[PDB]
């Protein structure tokens, strides 16, 4: 995509994530842990399903026969009929190709934008308490246990509790 998150500064995906499209991975003194996010996955799935539903819409029009395949018709009118049919076929083929290419182009950019938004939200949540490393990972300058990580995962993290300790650790 053109947001530089998927296949950008994030090197590769995870094959162990089976219950979502995006998730967290944490490590502290107690151990390691993994989880998944719900909102971004829902948004991506919703708009994909919307595209699929919009594609299969059915238009009701009825057509009938104009020529015969058992006994042939006069040449001069059959030539015109064949010419018109061949004219229509090219238009429909071109339309199909263009539509498929456009949708395929749009989907990937949508997914990349979702990933970038998820990253930026977490970056904004931890103000002046964590440091970026450049690979999609954060370093925290204070002690953060399982309850702290859980309170980071859902939007209920208060940065005033550990401001002084983190500032003292960063400055010196």
């Amino acid at each position: 995509g053109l947001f530089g998150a998927i296949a950008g500064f994030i090197e590769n995906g995870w094959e162990g994530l089976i219950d979502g499209w995006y998730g967290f991975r944490h490590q502290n003194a107690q151990g390691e842990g993994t989880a998944a996010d719900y909102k971004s996955t829902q948004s991506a799935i919703d708009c994909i399903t919307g595209k699929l539903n919009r594609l299969i819409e059915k238009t009701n029009q009825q057509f009938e026969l104009i020529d015969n395949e058992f006994t042939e018709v006069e040449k001069q009118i059959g030539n015109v009929i064949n010419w018109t049919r061949d004219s229509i076929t090219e238009v429909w083929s071109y339309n199909a190709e263009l539509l498929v290419a456009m949708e395929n182009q749009h989907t990937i950019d949508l997914a990349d934008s979702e990933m970038d938004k998820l990253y930026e939200r977490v970056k904004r949540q931890l103000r002046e308490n964590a440091e970026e490393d450049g690979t999609g990972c954060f370093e925290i300058f204070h002690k953060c246990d399982d309850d702290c990580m859980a309170s980071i995962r859902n939007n209920t993290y208060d940065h005033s509790k550990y401001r002084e300790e983190a500032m003292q650790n960063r400055i010196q």
Partner: protein
């Protein structure tokens, strides 16, 4: 001391799709948007179907011996086979394609008597090329011969007036004999001429005897002509010889659809798109089976496959 990180999922093997400025991009999912499978049967449930066998579509108006059970039919779907024929005596129709297109959507026919009566001449001409239990003719037309060999044929006129609310269909025929002596033997000597008149119609016809190649053991020919009558008008025939007179008039009823196929019929199904090989049942917007399908069908394209993405870009672990 502590660290938190973010990422996305991936799969071992993906699918290749096409984008605006790249070919062969690998993603996690894709689906197909072009249909390539069909059911090799004429699926038809909930509609009345009539399956003409050896009978041709145009025969039901005239009634050759092979169309004795389809003289007054009603249907919603009409199927014609390759072996159908609509003549027992050599001949052909005039402007047949328009009549076929009219009849394919008629939905059935109903017959009504005309009431013509004749005096002096004979009305029981029979041939050996149309056999029911001997020698017979078309079931809805009469062959007006002469009293005896090499006799006169008085000039006569007949008329018929429509009464019902809908237009009617009238069919008559002209006979071209093999030799010239046959014309004298069956209708007498001298010139022959017929004329047909109505409000929007004034035509004349004259037979043209001549030797031709033998078809079904016969050398003569019969030409069938037709016209459509407005619901308040009158039709007049004036003739001296070489006339095949009608006996009944036809009226349409309802509407239907007609196809040409070569497969059997299944009564436990549901479909709306037919072609000469079966039925197409799909929700995909495109098809690549046949270009002359009829009914409610998807659009026809030349491409064989077109994949639509359903996931993000696939980046497998190194």
């Amino acid at each position: 001391a502590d660290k938190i990180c973010l990422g996305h999922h991936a799969v071992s093997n993906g699918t290749k799709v096409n984008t605006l400025c790249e070919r062969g991009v690998e993603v996690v999912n894709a689906t197909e948007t072009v249909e390539r499978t069909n059911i090799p049967r004429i699926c038809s449930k909930g509609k009345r179907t009539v399956d003409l066998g050896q009978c041709g579509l145009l025969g039901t108006i005239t009634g050759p011996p092979q169309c004795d059970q389809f003289l007054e039919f009603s249907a919603d779907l009409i199927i014609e086979r390759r072996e159908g024929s609509d003549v027992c005596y050599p001949g052909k129709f005039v402007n047949e394609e328009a009549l076929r297109q009219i009849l394919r959507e008629s939905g059935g026919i109903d017959k009504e008597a005309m009431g013509f009566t004749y005096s002096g001449i004979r009305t029981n001409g029979a041939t050996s090329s149309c056999r029911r239990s001997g020698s017979s003719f078309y079931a809805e037309m009469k062959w007006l011969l002469s009293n005896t060999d090499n006799a006169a044929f008085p000039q006569m006129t007949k008329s018929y007036k429509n009464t019902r609310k809908n237009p009617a269909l009238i069919v008559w025929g002209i006979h071209h004999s093999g030799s010239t002596a046959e014309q004298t033997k069956l209708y007498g000597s001298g010139n022959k001429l017929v004329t047909v008149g109505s409000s929007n119609y004034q035509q004349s016809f004259v037979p043209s005897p001549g030797a031709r190649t033998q078809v079904n053991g016969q050398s003569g020919r019969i030409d069938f002509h037709w016209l459509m009558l407005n619901p308040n008008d009158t039709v007049t025939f004036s003739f001296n010889g070489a006339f095949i007179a009608p006996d009944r008039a036809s009226f349409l009823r309802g509407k239907s659809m007609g196809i040409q196929s070569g497969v059997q019929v299944d009564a436990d199904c549901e479909g709306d798109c037919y072609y000469s090989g079966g039925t197409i049942i799909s929700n995909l917007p495109f098809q690549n089976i046949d270009s002359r399908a009829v009914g409610k069908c998807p659009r026809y394209v030349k491409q064989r496959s077109l994949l639509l993405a359903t996931g993000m870009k696939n980046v497998p672990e190194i």
